[PDB]
Symmetry: D2
Subunit: 219 residues, 4 copies
């Protein structure tokens, strides 16, 4: 009924603008939806070398790639073959604010991702514009229904140079394309995201993510 | 200098709110030294808008603000070359927009290249249900933050049923030419009004009046 | 008629910021219809204060605001019985304060029982460092929310070296008597100033000027 | 770095004083816990200000991260802050504008932790879930722990389940400060927790509270 395969391809085009700098980024990769794992090779096609930390873009580069236990409704795998969309705001602690969206379709073995990313008000000598970010720290998304819609709320942190941290408050709304996909109960999604390799300027990046859904303590 | 007592305003806005793409053209006139401006707005692509027009109206130029002699006018000093702004709008129910405008002048006309993106407006909130009446009069705080002129404001939309709907906005302004003198802390009063519109807001007449001041007791 | 042209102000504040307990007494005067008040303040306990005195000053009465005829004056209408307010103050570096005042009146004097609690001010921040100079003049936005008069404001402290330090504040205002008529949306301009102080701010003279208006046009 | 004097089975003595929306209260607490298992229970009694006119649930995170199960590889700032103790300050920012701040000064004598807790809150809307007592429980959540401004900081966005099944968000920031010098600061880590009112009398004048807390490194090392 769902047509989600153990191994899937990922096609992606991201376009957007941060701090007035336009960019286009293409991604091709593979994932294991039932294992909650995915990888992607990315190439900056326009606007390279990027004047900002590549790390701010990486959560925009699909919750279908999360390991869901049987006892939790898997909204994302239940959304196919028709697919779904998400919208997200990223509010950073120094006033940098980004909005993003992805329209996700599926054709055969391949997920297609139309991603948009817009960012404003990053300070000139902040860690984003100065490329002082090292990685996203592992974090946990809270999944719950708000105004008829599945919503993911998370506070994430970028590890910085010198082992400082840089806070980002994120809210995502997820919407199945097909009418009447059953919404899940409150649950948690643990994730980690990692740049596996990159060239000096981050014109080429190999990206990986692992995500696991769960009910949290006590079980 | 470059600024004439009567100016023309040419504007194109392209954007996306809650997944809905749109294009809006603006043609108008204003008196920069009196801080007054009007515009006729025409929805080109994406009419009729599925969301409240009111969210867009602050994005449709601080050059049209009455500055007293004791306050540095950053905006009139930015011309002929012009300036750009970036803005975030954080609404109380989680809706978040980002906007930008690159402002140029040739002859007696200001040209505005405007982008507007918004996400996470609830289906039954006042924006998607078109339950807003107007922006209440407000006061923007201008000050320098990380080497850039920053405008901070809490605005409120009046709703049908008389409730108020809070928006927190931050704008950064940047002159194109190097070495334009940054002002000291000041305030800008403003009021914005949709003078007329057709049923579906595919046509809108918009007016704004803005006045800079020192605050109490010097205002 | 409860509001006289020249009134006195009695005040006791107690609180705790970043673990440090303090008591501060105030005695002042003002002109309710001119929207002007000043007060002499004295630290009775916990002096010298280890934090910037400025964080407390908006907690040291909107009855002292010049209201024009066309705006309902919730505050002067709340007397002789009084009103109370509650306020949260969210500073941009995570320092968060909450405050309360219960205001009563007898003759020509307002009595104020004030509480002020603050946490999470960083040691390297302007408050614990005492790098504040003044509150910049600001505009509070007054509207009804869930049946209660509410004031929302973005305020900013001028810092040494002319940086600013932002504070977001929400106040809820509550008349003691039933049937005090709620105003419509309006703005209140204010400026607050420490006029004089001794070295450690154990004694402080404070001044405020406030004016209600509709805004443009 | 040193021996904590923390025993496998500990007693907990607590007094909370506070004021929410102008309402003053005193609440006494007596419990027990297993520091190394990350588990604790407490019986709470309202001594002044009963019956409480707001949701008891807003207070329950205020009623000690000693009671967290720490792996060997993550520095345990809380157990290493003993025998001398530590204190925390916390802000609670609810989505409808209610704001609380809280403090706890934590000491130890023999097998007993002592807790001097202060809790103040303002601007809870009269018709909101807190003042209307429409909360059900805190959902399980994960706190992020890292060093900020030289201080161990816990940042968490938590949710109260409401009647009618909506959720009610609270953004909480805690700063933790050891009383003694020389307590090693931990690197970034996560703490999973669950908090539960096991039982209560009708007006919540008497409450039985339980919590389980587990620190980990997150994915993949969890
Ligand atoms: O996917 S994790 O390894 O960042
Ligand atoms: O711009 S004013 O007339 O609302
Ligand atoms: O009252 S003003 O001048 O600080
Ligand atoms: O403490 S747990 O059982 O919610």
């Amino acid at each position: 009924m769902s047509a989600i395969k153990p191994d899937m391809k990922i096609n992606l085009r991201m376009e957007g603008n941060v701090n007035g700098h336009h960019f286009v980024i293409d991604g091709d990769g593979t994932g294991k939806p039932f294992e909650g794992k995915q990888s992607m090779d990315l190439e900056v096609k326009e606007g390279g070398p990027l004047p900002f930390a590549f790390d701010i873009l990486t959560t925009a580069f699909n919750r279908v790639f999360a390991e869901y236990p049987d006892h939790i409704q898997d909204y994302f795998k239940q959304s196919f073959p028709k697919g779904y969309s998400w919208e997200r705001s990223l509010t950073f602690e120094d006033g940098g604010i980004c909005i993003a969206r992805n329209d996700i379709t599926m054709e055969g073995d391949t997920f297609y991702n139309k991603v948009r990313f817009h960012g404003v008000n990053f300070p000139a000598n902040g860690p984003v514009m100065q490329k002082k970010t090292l990685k996203w720290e592992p974090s946990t998304e809270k999944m719950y229904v708000r105004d008829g819609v599945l919503t993911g709320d998370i506070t994430m942190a970028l590890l910085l140079e010198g082992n400082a941290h840089y806070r980002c408050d994120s809210r995502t709304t997820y919407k199945a394309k097909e009418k009447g996909v059953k919404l899940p109960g409150y649950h948690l999604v643990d994730h980690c995201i990692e740049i596996l390799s990159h060239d000096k300027d981050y014109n080429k990046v190999k990206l990986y993510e692992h995500a696991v859904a769960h009910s949290g303590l006590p079980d």
